[PDB]
Amino acid sequence: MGSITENTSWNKEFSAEAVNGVFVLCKSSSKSCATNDLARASKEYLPASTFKIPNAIIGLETGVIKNEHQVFKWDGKPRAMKQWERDLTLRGAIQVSAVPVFQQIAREVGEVRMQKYLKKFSYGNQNISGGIDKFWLEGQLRISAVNQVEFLESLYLNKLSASKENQLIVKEALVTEAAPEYLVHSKTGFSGVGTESNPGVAWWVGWVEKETEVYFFAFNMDIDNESKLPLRKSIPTKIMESEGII
Ligand SMILES: [Cl-]
């Protein structure tokens, strides 16, 4: 990225709920970004389900996902969340964060092709060890908020090393709010509640298109109690509202 500037005034939205986290916000491009915590902005964490973004692109690139209208059928066997116990489109599986759908995508991509594309994407530490179907959930893969916004800006610009059509397919799957002159693409993640002295991580990453401007953002926070999870959206939303983005 370009320049990044620490703005400690944003910390008021964190301390209010005793949250340790970072928000990175870039206007127009990574030319100029702002953050509440420069050290944490470059610290790398498990991506959890924010990894569905590169995984979906790689699945399309490799042909494992045949096209954007593929239906991922539920075999009827129990899944960890009831919202996953149904047939899903690609967008549906991303939007409900259907881990088992993407675990099978990763298995079929395989370790050689997965490694190749994370290198091409400069995705975090590019470490896929720990099992092909779980390296982003409990393995050694790590990515920073800075790296997320660089990756997302490349996607927005169709500059990732993947076909433009596959990048466009994944982008429509990430739309979460649509209005005439306001468009949000975003993705959550949550590694879990961690262990004693080692909290989990929660994420919200995406970008906002308002009129003729675009803003890229990445948020993460330490979390050891699932009741705090909605803060991964509310804190960055309050910050973006205070910046006039909404
Ligand atoms: Cl499951």
The rounded Å distance from CA 11 to ligand 1 centre is 36
| Separation between Cα atoms, residue 150 and residue 134, nearest integer Å | 24
φ, ψ (nearest 5 deg) of residue 4: -130, 135
> Active site residue: 9, 32, 49, 129, which one?
49
Q: Is 15 one of the catalytic residues? A: no
Do the beta carbons of residue 44 and residue 103 sit within 8 Å?
no
The rounded Å distance from CA 107 to ligand 1 centre is 15
Resolution in A: 1.9
The rounded Å distance from CA 84 to ligand 1 centre is 7
Do the beta carbons of residue 205 and residue 217 sit within 8 Å?
yes
Q: Which residues of 116-154 are buried (b: 16+ CB within 10 A; e: fewer)?
A: ebbeebebbebebeeebbebbbebebbbbbbbbbbbbbb
List binding-site positions: 97, 188, 190, 232
List binding-site positions for a beta-lactam: 97, 188, 190, 232
Return the domain boundaries, the chain: 1-246
How many helices (H) and strands (E) the chain has is answered by 8, 11
Q: Which residue type sits at 153?
A: E
| Separation between Cα atoms, residue 70 and residue 91, nearest integer Å | 10
Q: Tell me yes or no: is domain 1-246 CATH 3.40.710.10.
A: yes
